[PDB]
DNA sequence: TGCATCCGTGAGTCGGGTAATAACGGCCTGTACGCGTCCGTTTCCGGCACCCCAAATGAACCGTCCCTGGCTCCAAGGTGAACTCTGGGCGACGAGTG
């Protein structure tokens, strides 16, 4: 599924659109350390992804 | 009444073909073939009695497949805010630096 289909918010949508993360398959493949490396990452984004 | 004298029986299996003598006119005809002429056949040009036959020549024709009128009734486009990152700019502080 697309991550946006999970009814996410402004910062997460902008991060997935500018960078190019499209499906939750790559998110479930990527670990928490591999996803928190992004700069200007939001604590709310971390909480919702967790 | 033997006795020789034939006499007639029989005796296995999957390169070819090799020749004389005196014979010779003369006449008849029988069938197949050739010549010339003649005639039924058939084969092809032409005409109306008309048989008309026909695509081509005049309508509608009107329902339908094209235009115009305008009316809407809604979702795309334009209008705010604030806000939550997003980022720029800013100040603080130090231990390797001088």
From Swiss-Prot:
Belongs to the RNA polymerase alpha chain family. It comes from the Bacteria. Signal peptide: none annotated. The chain holds residues 249 to 298 of 347 of the full protein. This is DNA-directed RNA polymerase subunit alpha. DNA-dependent RNA polymerase catalyzes the transcription of DNA into RNA using the four ribonucleoside triphosphates as substrates. The lineage of its organism: Bacteria, Bacillati, Actinomycetota, Actinomycetes, Mycobacteriales. Transmembrane segments: none annotated. Induction: 3-fold repressed by starvation. Homodimer. The RNAP catalytic core consists of 2 alpha, 1 beta, 1 beta' and 1 omega subunit. When a sigma factor is associated with the core the holoenzyme is formed, which can initiate transcription.
């Amino acid at each position: 599924l697309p991550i946006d289909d999970l009814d996410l918010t402004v910062r997460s949508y902008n991060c997935l659109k500018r960078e190019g993360v499209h499906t939750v398959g790559e998110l479930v493949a990527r670990t928490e350390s591999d996803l928190l490396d992004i700069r200007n990452f939001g604590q709310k984004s971390i909480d919702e992804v967790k």
